[PDB]
Amino acid sequence: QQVNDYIKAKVGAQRNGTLLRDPRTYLAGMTNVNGAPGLCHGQQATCEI
C-alpha cells in the first residue's frame, strides 16, 4: 500500500484531483464527473496509448 499510494500520488496526481472518476463516497452508488471548472477548447478528446 505504501508504494501504491506513492504511485497514485505521482502518476498524474490521481489523488486530490486531476482524475476522471470520483472515488469519494461512492458506496457503489453512482458514477460522476470530476474537475473541469471551465474549459476553453471543447469536449476533451480521450487519448489512449
Partner: protein, 49 residues
C-alpha cells in the same frame, strides 16, 4: 551550552533513523517542465514571490 563540536557531531549522527529534506532542496531537484506540472503543487503553493 558547550563549545566542543565533538559531542555535537556525535550526538547528531549517533542514532539518526529518519532523514528529512528541506523544501528548497526539493525544488532544485525538479526541472522546469516537471516543476510546473500540477502533480507538484506542494512546491508551487510556496513560490509566490
Amino acid at each position: 551550552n558547550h563549545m566542543n563540536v565533538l559531542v555535537i557531531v556525535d550526538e547528531f549522527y549517533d542514532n539518526k533513523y529518519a532523514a528529512p529534506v528541506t523544501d528548497i532542496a526539493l525544488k532544485c531537484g525538479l526541472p522546469t517542465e516537471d516543476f510546473l506540472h500540477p502533480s507538484n503543487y506542494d512546491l508551487l503553493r510556496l513560490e509566490l514571490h
